[PDB]
Amino acid sequence: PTVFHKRYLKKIRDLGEGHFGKVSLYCYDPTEMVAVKALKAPQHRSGWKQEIDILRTLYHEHIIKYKGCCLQLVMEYVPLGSLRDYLPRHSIGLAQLLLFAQQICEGMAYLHSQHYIHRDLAARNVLLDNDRLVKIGDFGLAKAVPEGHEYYRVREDGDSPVFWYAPECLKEYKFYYASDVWSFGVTLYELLTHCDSSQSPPTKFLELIGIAQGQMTVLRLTELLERGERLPRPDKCPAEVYHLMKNCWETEASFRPTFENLIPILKTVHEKYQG
Ligand SMILES: N#C[C@H]1C[C@@H]1C(=O)N[C@@]12C[C@@H]1CN(c1nc(Nc3cnn(CCO)c3)ncc1F)C2
């Protein structure tokens, strides 16, 4: 739609980076603040084409706004950044954390109804607009679920967010809509630990696995997940919220709530704490 011209984009700062992509804050000055995502200098390029196409077709209050092209991806600038960056610095209350959790489920329910799985649902991908507004802000691993199949066939990459993954992704390389609920449960844990690094999923799971394990991190991970071991209950996380988390972490994908199931549950649980 909108065609931003590169010569008018004024770099302000970096907002994020991955092994294949970078997001920068720009000032579009043809005489507005934009987040522009660029792929680094064919498989990652084809995946990049699908990424832009995926966000082009998404419109939801809890999904970062697609703003047009420049290929570079121009998106709205979400002012307070990732909850991963925000949370260790702002002691947000339980009620607001649960509102964020609900807002994530809404955007996820919407994403899922569009037949897309996210595959990278983490606090680093949840952007804070204001103290009462959150948006899923990155779709780098988002894929369409093929029409005659209930999941997408992943394939291992060294950069897979394995500490946010259900055993089916790690073992069978099958990503279901239910696999994003697992990730959501991990994002909910992150939010309740205030994104504290010493409490993070890679820190906590590597403490459980150990680091002398050769090529066997994923395998030791899958087997502890299969033994029913899980991330611990965050300090000051209510018993009920912890049980909802564990329910998101059922080993059986079908036993997990869907995002639709989570919306009324979170709505009720937020209303309770907001009082
Ligand atoms: N892998 C990989 C890496 C490259 C992919 C990446 O950076 N994706 C993103 C989720 C990050 C941030 N981001 C965006 N961030 C913002 N706002 C904003 C304000 N402060 N900050 C920094 C404190 O977090 C960010 N508005 C739009 C965005 F799009 C998009």
From Swiss-Prot:
Changing residue 37 to R: Complete loss of catalytic activity. This is Non-receptor tyrosine-protein kinase TYK2. The active site is at 120 (proton acceptor). The gene is TYK2. It is linked to Immunodeficiency 35: A primary immunodeficiency characterized by recurrent skin abscesses, pneumonia, and highly elevated serum IgE. Tyrosine kinase of the non-receptor type involved in numerous cytokines and interferons signaling, which regulates cell growth, development, cell migration, innate and adaptive immunity. Plays both structural and catalytic roles in numerous interleukins and interferons (IFN-alpha/beta) signaling. Associates with heterodimeric cytokine receptor complexes and activates STAT family members including STAT1, STAT3, STAT4 or STAT6. Residues 9-273 form the Protein kinase domain. Phosphorylated. Phosphorylation by JAK1 at Tyr-151 and Tyr-152 induces kinase activation. Disulfide bonds: none annotated. Interacts (via FERM domain) with JAKMIP1. Interacts with PIK3R1; this interaction is important for cell migration. Interacts with MPL/TPOR. Belongs to the protein kinase superfamily. Tyr protein kinase family. JAK subfamily. Observed in all cell lines analyzed. Expressed in a variety of lymphoid and non-lymphoid cell lines. ATP binds at residues 15-23, 37. The modification Phosphotyrosine is found at residues 151-152. Changing residue 242 to F: Does not affect phosphorylation state and enzymatic activity.
